[PDB]
Amino acid sequence: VSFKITLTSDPRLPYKVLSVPESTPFTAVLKFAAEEFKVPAATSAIITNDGIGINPAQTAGNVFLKHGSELRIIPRDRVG
Amino acid sequence: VSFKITLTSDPRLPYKVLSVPESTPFTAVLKFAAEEFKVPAATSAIITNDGIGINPAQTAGNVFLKHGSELRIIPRDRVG
Amino acid sequence: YEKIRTFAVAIVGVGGVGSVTAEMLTRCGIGKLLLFDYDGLSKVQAAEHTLRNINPDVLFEVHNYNITTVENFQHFMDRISNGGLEEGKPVDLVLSCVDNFEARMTINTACNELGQTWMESGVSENAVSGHIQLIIPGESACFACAPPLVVAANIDEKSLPTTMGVVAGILVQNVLKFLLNFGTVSFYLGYNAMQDFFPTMSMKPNPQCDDRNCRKQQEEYKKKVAALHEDNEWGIELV
Amino acid sequence: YEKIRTFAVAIVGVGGVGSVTAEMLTRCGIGKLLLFDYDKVELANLFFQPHQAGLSKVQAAEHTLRNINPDVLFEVHNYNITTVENFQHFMDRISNGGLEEGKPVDLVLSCVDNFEARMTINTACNELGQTWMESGVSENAVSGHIQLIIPGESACFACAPPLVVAANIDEKTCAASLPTTMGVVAGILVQNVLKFLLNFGTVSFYLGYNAMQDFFPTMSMKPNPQCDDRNCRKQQEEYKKKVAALEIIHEDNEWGIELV
Ligand SMILES: [Zn+2]
Ligand SMILES: [Zn+2]
Q1: Active site residue D174
Q2: What residue of B is the nearest CA neighbor of D228?
Q3: Which residues of chain C are within 8 Å of residue A43 when distances are taken between CB atoms?
Q4: Are A66 and C174 in contact (CB under 8 A)?
Q5: Nearest-CB residue to C27 (from D46, D184, D213)
Q6: Which has the least CB within 10 A, B4, B16, B77, D199?
């Protein structure tokens, strides 16, 4: 149900706590968190505290079960 | 007199404690400290913890009296 | 050192980041550059003309095609595998300096299949941010290990010069550290230009990564790991 | 923003760091660049092309940059600013060679390869009260930095002299990675230029680059009340006088996600 999501690209390493229903796709949690941090949702990705990448196309319940509460947003900068 | 001299350009912010006679020119303390850090003496400069720049052409006694023990070496990169 | 002349580097995308990166490696005396981009001349041909004038001793192989189409994908893999400094040998590194996720995913797919080490680079739309990333397939995170929301969610993709120069510079520096074995190679180095914050990380592979080749590379990696003072006149004392 | 077109930047030293820095600002649409260097382009020792060998670095740079952006104004001087005659001319052009003639430049950038010329720039800037950025790269390309000198407000270059300057030793002493390190420094230099001129983000008073470990320390160095440069001390006095006298829209929320 609850995640602490940290923004890695800001030196203050700010974080947001989000309570979510277990059935919510985690893609919507990511978006919601990116919006709270005012970074672009579309290009954000999510990793764990060990620095393991997560595919956010799964339920919040399953993300919680496999990885726990402590997740980290990284930018995936798209231009070149 | 004793100084704790920190190398600012190394992410470990390593430091060396040097005990020195008051009459020693601080230029020799700087050189000695640069040698301990294996950085070039000639291009190193010294600042305080508040980031106040120090001219090292004065005695260790006076450096100590005007600025205390906690000093920081910075590179002065010469090429451009 | 002149070890640099023995290496070949493929660059995909010769826009802002890749053009600077190609120039830096050309000036360094890289043995060979392979340039891939897709649009009078083509961007890769223009880039080749500029670079050849800068250093005539660098070899160039350029391809104006979209690597994401089915025919060109096989030719792309062929050239990563055989277009090194010696023909029949792979390139030493691929660099991604493309402007879209589709092409990053194609490069990723090719590199995971081939076991080819690559670096990825990017810049944000607003020039406020960028990064570089080292993907050694199986050992560090591949690009599909942590997909951005749009890749994961299957949505179709539908000041800049300074940020590009920083990213290209740190990219090349990582290339030289990697090829020449000096300093510490970053697995990940971000750049936040607003606050001058440059975070390093080392991201590990996702054991359930969507790329099945990433998974197999992870298996092979685990296996491989499992197989093993001229004077001191003033009496200054170090306390 | 097009505020960038309203500003003028002087660059001293158009070798590795300065030539890239000039290119970046030209591409950004700076109103005007002033370029100061005396060396020629050489086949021996970034930016320049082979067919430009034997031209003055400032002319070569001007020829290339004018074509990259025709709307940028250029003034160039092929002279050594440390000689007594050229020093006065250097100061005149910092004071009057802004975007509008008769106004000062907005910034001076130091991209020179020696301490003597840094000291010259520092001496001019302290006399004039001109803000400048200093830049440098180590001999072995492992390291570099940028620094913002606002005379009287932050440390000048004489405030914390390197040992050789302090000890009056004469300056009496390339690696594959030199061009790359110069590019990084130039890029963070220009980024700081823009932050400063355009008032976005945080301007660094000091930003280092250690390429071995990818470590980028920031700090802010304060003026030395006993600085050797008497005009630094006077600027510190004037600064103190001046100081004493001067949301979240979630597009949809279908899933009941709560910010706790
Ligand atoms: Zn993967
Ligand atoms: Zn000063």
Answers
A1: yes
A2: B55
A3: 124, 148-150
A4: no
A5: D46
A6: D199
Domain that holds residue C216: 1-239
One-letter amino acid at C51 equals L
Q: Which residues, in sequence order, are bridge partners of residue C9? A: C33, C93
Burial track C13-39 (b if 16+ CB lie within 10 A, e otherwise): bbbbbbbbbbbbbbbbebbbbbbbbbe
Sign (positive or negative) of CA dihedral B34, B39, B41, B43: negative
B61 touching D (Cβ < 8 Å):
no
Cα-Cα end-to-end distance for chain D: 38
Nearest to D253, CA basis, from C38, C101, A29: A29
Looking only at the bridges linking them, the beta strands covering C188-192 and C129-135 are antiparallel
Strand B70-75 versus strand B2-7 pairing type:
parallel
Structure's resolution in angstroms: 1.9
D125 is in an annotated binding site: no
Asked if residue D111 belongs to a known ligand binding site, the reply is no
The 10 Å Cβ neighbour count of residue C109 is 19
Alpha carbon distance C16, A77 (integer Å): 14
- Residue D222's DSSP bridge partners are B52
Judged by a CB distance cut-off of 8 A, whether residue B41 touches chain D is: yes
* Alpha-helical regions (H) of D80-114: 84-96
Residue D163 sits at the chain B interface (C-beta within 8 Å): yes
The residue annotated as part of the active site, out of D28, D111, D125, D174, is: D174
Euclidean distance between CA atoms D58 and D19, whole angstroms: 9
Distance CA B18, CA D242 (A): 40
Here the tokens at position D176 are 């594959």
Ligand 1 geometric centre to CA of C140 (Å): 8
CATH label of the domain that carries residue C2: 3.40.50.720
| D216 contact partners, CB below 8 Å, separation of at least 6 | C196, C198, D207, D208, D209, D210
Q: What is the experimental method?
A: X-ray
User: What number of other Cβ atoms are within 10 A of residue C225's Cβ?
Assistant: 10
Q: Has D232 been labeled as part of a binding site? A: yes
B: neighbours with 3+ CB pairs under 8 Å?
C, D
Domain count, chain C: 1
Hey, is the C-beta of D150 within 8 angstroms of any chain B C-beta?
no
Domains of chain A are 1-80 (3.10.20.90)
**Residue of chain D with shortest Cα separation from A16:** D259
Spatial neighbors of D193 by CB under 8 A, at least 6 apart, are: D9, D25, D107, D109, D133
The reply to whether residue D143 touches residue B52, judged by beta carbons under 8 angstroms, is no
| Cβ-based neighbours of B75, under 8 Å, separated by 6 or more | B9, B39, B43, B44, B45, D138, D143, D145, D208
Residue C12: strand, helix, or coil: strand
Interior/surface letters D64-76, b for 16+ CB within 10 angstroms, e for the rest: bbeeeeeebebbb
3-state DSSP of C171-195: HHHHHHHHHHCCCCCCCEEEEECCC
Q: Which residue has the tokens 């200093």?
A: D134
**D156 to C72, D56, D117: CA distances (angstroms):** 57, 30, 14
